[PDB]
Design a protein around this nucleic acid. Structure first.
Ligand SMILES: Nc1ncnc2c1ncn2[C@H]1C[C@H](O)[C@@H](COP(=O)(O)NP(=O)(O)OP(=O)(O)O)O1
Ligand SMILES: [Mn+2]
Ligand SMILES: [Mn+2]
Ligand code: NA
Ligand code: NA
Length: 325
DNA sequence: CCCACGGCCCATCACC
DNA sequence: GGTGATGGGC
DNA sequence: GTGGG
């Protein structure tokens, strides 16, 4: 919010690279720039000034100058005029359409929401839903509403089995007053790392949430990972917006490693994994393993609470709300 | 003065 | 029908 | 596009 005009300008450039040029590195750099550029406590008022920030370099500093000097940036503007590049960017905002599906659709003449519907034949299921809820999906969720959602989920999960475990992770757990999707994490004592596999254990609890017409439609669904759509109920009235809900089922013993992952910033999850590597470990969404001076991953370490990981690699315990990187 | 640069689950497609 | 690769998302 | 090396 300090250097806001810059963060926006860069976030656009990042989306462009990801969406159009399929240059994920140049994308991530603009994000790390723009990400860790607002972590900065000082109004940037020089590209040369900005260059001193980590991940900000010659080109971005060159581009920052033009924005500070003229209030615009020719490059981005040129992209906005390209009727094609703009059409590729936009479509990716549909869920299920990525850089590949999007460049392939604009080639064949599909440039707008209007074409998508006409060409619904071409679209696969996930994309058929991202279209349906295109508007409601670009809205943010406020905690007040999120809090309601959290009550239903827990209610209907226990009602299936008293021994279940379910924690709302992601933006919400970090104090985030606004949220994009609802990230959920499910476990059971009867599901641990050394058990064969899940006997309808995730399906069981999804059905209930569909039975109470909370989960409306379904984007993807497997034995471990469910992506879908949910909605709150209104009294009297105006309908609530449809929202994205991710539900992930993990084994109980690995629970504290997934809660940590699926909560802390994608950058945070990257900030800490770096330290863990420098500090001799390799963590992931399920385990924290040690690495011999050769680099050979050892057997999974014992984890009984989120704080455990944050001693192994040391680091200052950043409690979820402080983890907004 | 170059060049790694992140990993996992689900769904679909191309090929057989 | 069963593959292995790829795309997409998070 | 960037910074480690
Ligand atoms: N490569 C990666 N890919 C996906 N998720 C990652 C990740 N690295 C870390 N995560 C962690 C970080 C994420 O928090 C978590 C999934 O949450 P999201 O729905 O992706 N985004 P969030 O909940 O943070 O905010 P909001 O929903 O309001 O936009 O997984
Ligand atoms: Mn989220
Ligand atoms: Mn999510
Ligand atoms: Na720098
Ligand atoms: Na999208």
């Amino acid at each position: 919010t300090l250097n806001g005009g810059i963060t926006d300008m860069l976030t656009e450039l990042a989306n462009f690279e990801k969406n159009v040029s399929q240059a994920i590195h140049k994308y991530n750099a603009y994000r790390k720039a723009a990400s860790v550029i607002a972590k900065y406590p000082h109004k940037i008022k020089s590209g040369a000034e900005a260059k001193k920030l980590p991940g900000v370099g010659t080109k971005i500093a060159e581009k920052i100058d033009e924005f500070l000097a003229t209030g615009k940036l020719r490059k981005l503007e040129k992209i906005r005029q390209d009727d094609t590049s703009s059409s590729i960017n936009f479509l990716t905002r549909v869920s299920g359409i990525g850089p590949s599906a999007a460049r392939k659709f604009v080639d064949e003449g599909i440039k707008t929401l209007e074409d998508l519907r006409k060409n619904e034949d071409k679209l696969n299921h996930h994309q058929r839903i991202g279209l349906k809820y295109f508007g409601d999906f670009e809205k943010r969720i406020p905690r007040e509403e999120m809090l309601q959602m959290q009550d239903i989920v827990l209610n209907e999960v226990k009602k299936v089995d008293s021994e279940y475990i379910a924690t709302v992770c992601g933006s919400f757990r970090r104090g985030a007053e606004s949220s994009g999707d609802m990230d959920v994490l499910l476990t059971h004592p009867s599901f641990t790392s050394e058990s064969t596999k899940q006997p309808k254990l995730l399906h069981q609890v999804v059905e209930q949430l569909q039975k109470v017409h909370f989960i409306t439609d379904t984007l993807s669904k497997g034995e471990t990972k469910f992506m879908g759509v949910c909605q709150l109920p209104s009294k009297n009235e105006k309908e609530y917006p449809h929202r994205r809900i991710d539900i992930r089922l993990i084994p109980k013993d690995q629970y504290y490693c997934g809660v940590l992952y699926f909560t802390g910033s994608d950058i945070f999850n990257k900030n800490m994994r770096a330290h863990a590597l420098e500090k001799g470990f390799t963590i992931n969404e399920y385990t924290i393993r040690p690495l011999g001076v050769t680099g050979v991953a050892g057997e999974p370490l014992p984890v009984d609470s989120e704080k455990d990981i944050f001693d192994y690699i040391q680091w200052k315990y950043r409690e979820p709300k402080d983890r907004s990187e």
